[model samples]
Target: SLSNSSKVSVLISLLEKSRDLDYIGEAINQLEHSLQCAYFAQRSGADNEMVLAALLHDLGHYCNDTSFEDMGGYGVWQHEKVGADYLRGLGFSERVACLIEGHVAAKRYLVSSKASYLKNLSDASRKTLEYQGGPMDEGERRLFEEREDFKDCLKIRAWDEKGKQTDLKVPGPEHYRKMMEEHLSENQ
Candidate 1:
């Protein structure tokens, strides 16, 4: 649990960094969508940790340029690893980092199983995968299988897919402020 100030600071930092990207509007939209997913997950009885992880899973995209090139040609930009690394450096719990890192495994699996997966991928994502030797390799597939977060990652990924509806009634920043206040109070 972080203080309200700390939460605000985190969000502001994220937003400020995000504004520098080529697709600032889309990035902001993604952040809002992420928060909405977390809120709905919490409302649906997800644990606090899971909700928080959902809310901030893409925190790494804010830490630096999420340009396709920066992701080392991995499909979906490998933003999960970036987010995990950022949170881990900031002393976030292992659960949160794992959740972020593994959330995209579903996409990887889908790509391997479904020939139509490429159609769903954004152009940048597709290019990145091509650069990375086209989707998850044998080692990645094996490691993804061995990860303890496989299930939770799948859940998060499912929630992520469902949370993409722009019509969903996600709360605004004030709601997040309230959540932050309450979470901090409980922790204190």
Candidate 2:
């Protein structure tokens, strides 16, 4: 594998190329959303790996990778798997990859258990929720709630929702190059 710096280098380049890409249901562009998510995680005192996970959570949306679930929407929605699996392949921590996978479940869990949760979502998110399985059933909820990192996924998802803001300016992807360099993997 390439040096961690190059790993981040390539990630930053891809983000810049698709910076203007419309985030499926958010007001901000992809890069804006990513940067803002990272900023949120950082301000909350997240460790490097968590911060990187926040930044790269939605990355697969811009690629051709398949998500873990079908979501049964207009098309196959697979960004969670796509992003996390790619990062896993590149040697990111399993926690980071699992956080990415668990985000959708967190959303589903909240919506299923909290009457107020659905109202907190943006219109786009609400619309997409249906395709994203609506909510977890009782059994699924139990299964989802048992994971040790479940709350971390929930926290990341919370940041994900709060991260979409067109007026918010965040540090560039370059802000976390060091974190990515140090946190991702062993390299030559």
Candidate 3:
């Protein structure tokens, strides 16, 4: 394990590394997608923790572990959980990890409940949606509805699905660097 400062550096470095990697099936690179999500979260008046969660939601793609499984050649397996677990291991607050983890559930809910949601998904997203269980049943929907942070989780999911712009003007990791450092300091 790394010290708090080193952990923060490593986390930020992960984001930077994503700059070169394509975002699965999206038009933008992974880092750009993450930055756009954070910018959207900040614009939507989300708290610092939620904003941070938005930034790190897809970080599981950067993780190297057995958790990664290909789903019929779609994408990583339960990357939300993988990313959340990685963040918690690095000393992030449970709220952040929870938000990150909840995004998948949120997407399931949206897909199951809203026809427009399924219609609007990009082609690649649509493929992965099939692999991600193709929407929740009523049972999973009710369980997701009972979460304390349900709304916040949905907010992050909304930002994630919409942050695939190719040329959106957004801040870089430096914009979140100070907040990340302060977060580590407080949690350390």
Candidate 2 C-alpha error for residue 36, in Å = 1.1
Structure candidate 1, residue pairs in collision: 73-128
lDDT of 1 at 177: 53
TM-score for candidate 3: 0.87
**Lowest summed lDDT window (length 10), candidate 3:** 65-74
For candidate 3, the lDDT comes to 0.80
User: Each model's TM-score, in the order given?
Assistant: 0.66, 0.85, 0.87
Model 3, position 76, has a per-residue lDDT of: 30
Candidate 2: tens digits of C-alpha lDDT, residues 84-180: 7777777788888899877888889888988688877877678878888788899999998899998888888888888767687689987888878
Q: Which candidate, 1 or 3, has the higher TM-score?
A: 3
lDDT of each: 0.62, 0.77, 0.80
Per residue, candidate 1 scores C-alpha lDDT tens digits across 1-188 of 55556755665456445444432135336656676678777887988667867876765563344432332324434578876765565455678778888766656755665667667665555565665556676677777778777767767766665555645676655455555445545544
Which residues of candidate 3, in runs, are more than 4 Å off? 24-26, 62-77
Candidates 1 and 2: which is better by TM-score? 2
**Of candidates 3 and 1, the better by lDDT:** 3
Which segments of candidate 1 are over 4 A away from where they belong? 1-8, 12-28, 62-78, 137-140, 173-188
